Amino acid sequence: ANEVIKCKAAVAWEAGKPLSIEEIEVAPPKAHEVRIKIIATAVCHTDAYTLSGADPEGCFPVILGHLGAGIVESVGEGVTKLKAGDTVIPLYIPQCGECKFCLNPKTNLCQKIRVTQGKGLMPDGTSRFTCKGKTILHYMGTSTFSEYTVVADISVAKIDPLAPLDKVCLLGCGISTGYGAAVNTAKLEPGSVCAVFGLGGVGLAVIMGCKVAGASRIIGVDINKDKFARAKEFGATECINPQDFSKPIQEVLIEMTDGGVDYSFECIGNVKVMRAALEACHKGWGVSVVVGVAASGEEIATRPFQLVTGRTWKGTAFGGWKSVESVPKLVSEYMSKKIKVDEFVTHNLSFDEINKAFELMHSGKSIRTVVKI
Amino acid sequence: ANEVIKCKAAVAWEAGKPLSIEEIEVAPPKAHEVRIKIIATAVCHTDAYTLSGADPEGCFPVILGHLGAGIVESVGEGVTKLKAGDTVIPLYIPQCGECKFCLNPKTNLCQKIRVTQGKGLMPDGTSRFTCKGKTILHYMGTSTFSEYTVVADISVAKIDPLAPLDKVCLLGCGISTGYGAAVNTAKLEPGSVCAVFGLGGVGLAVIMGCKVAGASRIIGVDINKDKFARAKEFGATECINPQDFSKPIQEVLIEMTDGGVDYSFECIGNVKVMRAALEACHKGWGVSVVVGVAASGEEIATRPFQLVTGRTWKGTAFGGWKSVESVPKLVSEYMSKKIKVDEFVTHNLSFDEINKAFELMHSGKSIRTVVKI
Numbered sequence: 228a229n230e231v232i233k234c235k236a237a238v239a240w241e242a243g244k245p246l247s248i249e250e251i252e253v254a255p256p257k258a259h260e261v262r263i264k265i266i267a268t269a270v271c272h273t274d275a276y277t278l279s280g281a282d283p284e285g286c287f288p289v290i291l292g293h294l295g296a297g298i299v300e301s302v303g304e305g306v307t308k309l310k311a312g313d314t315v316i317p318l319y320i321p322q323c324g325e326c327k328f329c330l331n332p333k334t335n336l337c338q339k340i341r342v343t344q345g346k347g348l349m350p351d352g353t354s355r356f357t358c359k360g361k362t363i364l365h366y367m368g369t370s371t372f373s374e375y376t377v378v379a380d381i382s383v384a385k386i387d388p389l390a391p392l393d394k395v396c397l398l399g400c401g402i403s404t405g406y407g408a409a410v411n412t413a414k415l416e417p418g419s420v421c422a423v424f425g426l427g428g429v430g431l432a433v434i435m436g437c438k439v440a441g442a443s444r445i446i447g448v449d450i451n452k453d454k455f456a457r458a459k460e461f462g463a464t465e466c467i468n469p470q471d472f473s474k475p476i477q478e479v480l481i482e483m484t485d486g487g488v489d490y491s492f493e494c495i496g497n498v499k500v501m502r503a504a505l506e507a508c509h510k511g512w513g514v515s516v517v518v519g520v521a522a523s524g525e526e527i528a529t530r531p532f533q534l535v536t537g538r539t540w541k542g543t544a545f546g547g548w549k550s551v552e553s554v555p556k557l558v559s560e561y562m563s564k565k566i567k568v569d570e571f572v573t574h575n576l577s578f579d580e581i582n583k584a585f586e587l588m589h590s591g592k593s594i595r596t597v598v599k600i
Numbered sequence: 601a602n603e604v605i606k607c608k609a610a611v612a613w614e615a616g617k618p619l620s621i622e623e624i625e626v627a628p629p630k631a632h633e634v635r636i637k638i639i640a641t642a643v644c645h646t647d648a649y650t651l652s653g654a655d656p657e658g659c660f661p662v663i664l665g666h667l668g669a670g671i672v673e674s675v676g677e678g679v680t681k682l683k684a685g686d687t688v689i690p691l692y693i694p695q696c697g698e699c700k701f702c703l704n705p706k707t708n709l710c711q712k713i714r715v716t717q718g719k720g721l722m723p724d725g726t727s728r729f730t731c732k733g734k735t736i737l738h739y740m741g742t743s744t745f746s747e748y749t750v751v752a753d754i755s756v757a758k759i760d761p762l763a764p765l766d767k768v769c770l771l772g773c774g775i776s777t778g779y780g781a782a783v784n785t786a787k788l789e790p791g792s793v794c795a796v797f798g799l800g801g802v803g804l805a806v807i808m809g810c811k812v813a814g815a816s817r818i819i820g821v822d823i824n825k826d827k828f829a830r831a832k833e834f835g836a837t838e839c840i841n842p843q844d845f846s847k848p849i850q851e852v853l854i855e856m857t858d859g860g861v862d863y864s865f866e867c868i869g870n871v872k873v874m875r876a877a878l879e880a881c882h883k884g885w886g887v888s889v890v891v892g893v894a895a896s897g898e899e900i901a902t903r904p905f906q907l908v909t910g911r912t913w914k915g916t917a918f919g920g921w922k923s924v925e926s927v928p929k930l931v932s933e934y935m936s937k938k939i940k941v942d943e944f945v946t947h948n949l950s951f952d953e954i955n956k957a958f959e960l961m962h963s964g965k966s967i968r969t970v971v972k973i
């Protein structure tokens with residue numbers, strides 16, 4: 228019988244402070260839940276945003292983390308598609324396959340468990356984590372900063388048993404988001420002229436997608452020139468630094484492309500750049516995709532003339548991938564070398580050093596850091 | 601040979617003043633120009649915008665008007681596809697068929713003569729209008745408020761010679777814009793749930809297009825309930841007045857559609873309503889179209905979360921129709937009764953009462969007023 232598990236986890240007792248390595252208890256999975264042994268995890272800006280306390284919806288104490296790969300340790304009642312030993316990736320965007328969103332080909336935003344998930348709880352309204360006599364909340368329905376986590380059975384992607392978990396955990400968010408922004412949201416055509424604002428992991432993934440799609444010109448934009456080299460390796464035909472020009476960045480791009488780009492992607496989360504990305508698009512057919520998540524309250528703006536004269540403004544969540552059915556396919560594309568993952572890993576750390584992963588992220592010295600549990 | 605023509609035209613001597621019927625002189629057409637006898641015309645908010653003096657680009661004196669239908673009186677050298685007697689509709693959006701925009705199937709914004717057209721001149725850099733010894737400017741490459749006008753040969757659509765000119769002159773802007781916003785810009789699918797903000801001529805044309813496309817629900821929105829009857833005649837399944845509700849109109853629409861509409865169209869020119877129209881769209885797949893050119897200056901805004909979670913923002917000025925090739929097809933659709941035009945005409949006036957057409961438009965008493973030259 229499934230017993231309570233005593234293991235290590237990185238707990239955020241309060242905002243603005245380092246994660247605390249603690250000994251916690253993980254309850255067995257209830258009906259339609261899956262307990263996963265996390266093998267590898269990584270840190271994302273979203274985790275840091277919540278940890279800083281700047282996130283209006285952030286609640287503590289909580290076990291953060293939404294990028295992970297592992298093995299099913301046990302399943303609850305009613306679970307038949309998954310079993311102990313299955314190789315999996317936890318998903319913050321689930322796929323129940325029965326709601327109006329899952330049934331609609333135009334979206335991947337399953338709403339089946341969003342309410343409880345937003346509160347850091349399992350679908351039944353409770354948490355499976357406890358530490359020092361306190362209930363600890365879940366995060367983004369995944370909580371990967373633990374040796375063991377429990378997730379809703381619709382938040383699990385079963386993947387290739389041969390996949391290297393110390394690499395594919397990155398497909399949990401960033402890589403899939405950027406890649407999908409190109410092939411799913413923008414659906415750019417061969418020969419397309421593109422501009423990518425922000426050359427971090429997300430921007431590099433967008434570039435990767437543009438390349439797969441057959442883009443002719445891919446202009447990388449970043450205020451940190453140290454990001455240009457890798458952007459080039461991923462496919463950027465050239466890179467520019469907004470700081471090297473007096474004119475607004477959109478005017479520079481328009482001049483370079485004789486009118487503007489066919490597709491632009493904002494991978495920073497800056498509302499001013501999001502406007503710039505839209506205005507950098509070509510009149511008549513340009514399309515700009517917001518990939519970055521801006522801070523609460525901030526608004527994007529532009530003159531309606533921009534839309535009336537042909538430009539389209541879009542956005543994407545997890546690259547538009549129907550999670551449960553698509554993540555396994557993404558793993559397979561990586562295994563077959565259609566897409567890259569290893570090239571995103573710039574650092575490797577042990578679980579006890581998880582806080583250093585956040586630090587490296589602030590310094591802008593890394594792309595992705597994989598934490599070995 | 602083609603001689604100078606002495607006729608009457610409604611001249612706008614200065615911003616903020618009524619139009620004046622004056623005796624003017626119209627020069628014969630030069631190379632690649634066409635002189636047209638205008639039979640019927642109509643006024644548009646755009647003409648009024650320029651006339652008010654609010655348009656930063658407006659210059660005087662000028663002969664306004666861009667909605668008309670007439671007969672070719674004569675053609676200049678080099679013109680072979682058109683001849684005296686041809687039934688035509690002048691176009692403010694030309695189609696040279698050779699520029700970057702004409703060659704791209706995703707747009708209809710021909711740029712061949714935009715520079716001179718913006719200055720109220722023919723492609724050769726001069727005007728064909730004079731009045732009392734003064735040069736009078738052209739407008740939107742059409743200047744339909746004259747018994748005779750001269751336009752670039754790429755600004756002419758040759759139509760069915762049996763078409764009633766006192767009706768099809770309306771296809772010169774609004775009707776084509778609204779109809780096209782539905783079938784070209786939005787490309788809504790059968791069964792779609794739509795919302796149309798503004799029930800004037802443009803909004804009615806959008807409704808007409810949604811019905812042609814097979815929409816399951818078409819919710820008309822207007823603060824003037826007197827516009828509801830005709831909206832339902834055109835196909836609206838429901839009509840709502842924002843003033844009847846205490847909460848924001850987007851919240852109202854979301855509630856009556858269990859999440860929001862599949863497509864929304866803003867046909868008012870109000871930036872606040874444009875934002876409402878976007879936010880009224882369904883999460884994951886909603887699309888909002890800003891219909892028609894609005895007044896420059898004000899910006900539209902929203903939180904990027906709206907786009908990241910699936911909504912798309914678009915716009916259109918002329919409904920996306922490649923002008924020279926499609927306007928004749930629209931006339932044919934009217935002749936075959938696929939689309940309506942007669943139903944838009946609520947008033948008829950003589951040329952010397954042209955100012956009353958402006959008054960009727962601003963009072964909200966009319967949908968479309970046809971002015972007989």
Ligand SMILES: NC(=O)c1ccc[n+]([C@@H]2O[C@H](COP(=O)([O-])OP(=O)(O)OC[C@H]3O[C@@H](n4cnc5c(N)ncnc54)[C@H](O)[C@@H]3O)[C@@H](O)[C@H]2O)c1
Pocket residue numbers: 272273400401404424425426427428429430448449450451454469494495496497500517518519520521543544545546591593594908
């Ligand atoms: N929509 C989604 O589903 C989705 C998924 C994952 C990540 N996010 C968002 O994507 C964004 C990027 O993630 P990341 O891991 O690549 O972050 P990152 O910090 O590693 O990369 C951001 C890059 O933007 C560059 N940058 C910052 N300001 C700039 C400016 N003004 N002009 C040009 N470049 C500038 C930075 O130098 C850095 O290279 C964040 O907002 C993240 O939250 C969204």
Ligand SMILES: NC(=O)c1ccc[n+]([C@@H]2O[C@H](COP(=O)([O-])OP(=O)(O)OC[C@H]3O[C@@H](n4cnc5c(N)ncnc54)[C@H](O)[C@@H]3O)[C@@H](O)[C@H]2O)c1
Pocket residue numbers: 645646649774797798799800801802803821822823824827842866867868869870873891892893894895961964966967
């Ligand atoms: N200066 C300009 O360029 C200018 C000015 C106004 C409108 N626009 C264009 O005019 C076109 C509309 O043309 P039309 O002939 O149909 O105009 P119209 O004036 O006949 O119709 C506009 C309708 O909007 C309704 N309306 C106004 N404010 C409302 C609100 N807050 N909420 C809901 N309904 C409201 C009005 O009652 C009217 O029925 C649009 O394409 C718009 O972009 C341009």
Ligand SMILES: [K+]
Pocket residue numbers: 413414415416
């Ligand atoms: K596309």
Ligand SMILES: [K+]
Pocket residue numbers: 786787788789
């Ligand atoms: K569509």
Ligand SMILES: [Zn+2]
Pocket residue numbers: 271272273274293400401
């Ligand atoms: Zn993330």
Ligand SMILES: [Zn+2]
Pocket residue numbers: 321322323324325326327328329336337338339
């Ligand atoms: Zn679902």
Ligand SMILES: [Zn+2]
Pocket residue numbers: 644645646647666773774
């Ligand atoms: Zn008009």
Ligand SMILES: [Zn+2]
Pocket residue numbers: 694695696697698699700701702709710711712
């Ligand atoms: Zn052209």
